[PDB]
């Protein structure tokens, strides 16, 4: 196939960068900080200006000391290593990465449309065609990632940005890992967790296809299939094998969702003999032109409004915080390959 060929060349490209990662391609003083776009446990994302090019980027800042306390060293090394090596239309481009005494930095392409999350909650829910446009782009992305033996593990509206053209950009590869065969780390976000993960069984790429189904459901229904006020209550709902669809769900949608939200891994779409084709040749995606989604020529159902470069009006406001850099190098050995 021409997809198979595209992937084969793509694996050669990825392997070259994987084996020989890039390093310290910038310094903090080359950027002007502007606004915190987002926050997390190990640090925040900031809109940043590249003073020499005048280009705006999103810069993810991780406090080394906090990464270590939360036992995320290996995870943080995976994220930079994978992200500098991959290249796909719906994956954030990592432009620069560097570290100082106190922090790790990854400068990435800035997607002014904001988080899908923000629009999804506001509007309430997406129409199937709307949801499908976004879903189709995730299907391709996973197809590509999984061909590289990468698992993604944190799919959710929060990690999907809308760019200027209204296409998705997958950020946050904080849990991405290159694994042939199986892995056991409990990570992800409670609502998106596959039962395998919560049952400490050992798991593989298939958890991404489960998460895709949570996503489609949440986009189309405006809420996730398993919610509750505390995580344990959510985990029970997930392991129970029991989903209710809203009544406005097309039956094709329900049907795709039932195969994706399947507790039996041997039976879950994405994990069978035909892998990703079971998803792409499903009735719900009949309307979808995959090559054209890939080539970015489909009209996006929703272009967010942006009144310039560096406009941040599609992001919530956060409390700012002065970037402290210690005079002592903080965890050199642990992060040497960053």
């Amino acid at each position: 196939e021409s997809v198979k060929e595209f992937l084969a060349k793509a694996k050669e490209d990825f392997l070259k960068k994987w084996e020989n990662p890039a390093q310290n391609t910038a310094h903090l003083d080359q950027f002007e900080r502007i606004k915190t776009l987002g926050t997390g446990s190990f640090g925040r994302v900031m809109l940043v200006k590249h003073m020499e090019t005048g280009n705006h980027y999103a810069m993810k800042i991780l406090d080394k000391q906090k990464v270590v306390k939360l036992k995320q060293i290996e995870h943080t090394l995976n994220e930079k290593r994978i992200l500098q090596a991959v290249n796909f239309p719906f994956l954030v481009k990592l432009e620069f990465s560097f570290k100082d005494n106190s922090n790790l930095y990854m400068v990435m392409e800035y997607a002014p449309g904001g988080e899908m999350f923000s629009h999804l909650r506001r509007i309430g829910r997406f129409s199937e065609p709307h949801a499908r446009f976004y879903a189709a782009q995730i299907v391709l992305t996973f197809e590509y990632l999984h061909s590289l033996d990468l698992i993604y593990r944190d799919l959710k509206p929060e990690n999907l940005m809308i760019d200027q053209q209204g296409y998705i950009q997958v950020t946050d590869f904080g849990f991405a890992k290159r694994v042939k065969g199986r892995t056991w780390t409990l990570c992800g976000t409670p609502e998106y967790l596959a039962p395998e993960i919560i049952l400490s069984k050992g798991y593989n790429k298939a958890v991404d296809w489960w998460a895709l189904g949570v996503l489609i459901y949440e986009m189309a229904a405006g809420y996730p299939p398993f919610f509750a006020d505390q995580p344990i209550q959510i985990y029970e709902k997930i392991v129970s094998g029991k989903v209710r669809f809203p009544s406005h769900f097309s039956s094709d949608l329900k049907d795709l969702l039932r195969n994706l939200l399947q507790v039996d891994l041997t039976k879950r779409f994405g994990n069978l003999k035909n892998g990703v084709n079971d998803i792409k040749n499903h009735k719900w995606f009949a309307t979808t032109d995959w090559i054209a989604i890939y080539q970015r020529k489909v009209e996006a159902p929703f272009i967010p409004k942006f009144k310039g470069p560096g406009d941040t009006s599609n992001f919530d406001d956060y409390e700012e915080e002065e970037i402290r850099v210690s005079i002592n190098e903080k965890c050199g050995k642990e992060f040497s390959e960053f």
Partner: peptide, 20 residues
């Protein structure tokens, strides 16, 4: 309604990952 129970729940905001 389910929407209304969701909206009244503690998890309509941005959801943090669990680490370990």
């Amino acid at each position: 309604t389910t929407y209304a129970d969701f909206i009244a729940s503690g998890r309509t905001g941005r959801r943090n990952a669990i680490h370990d």
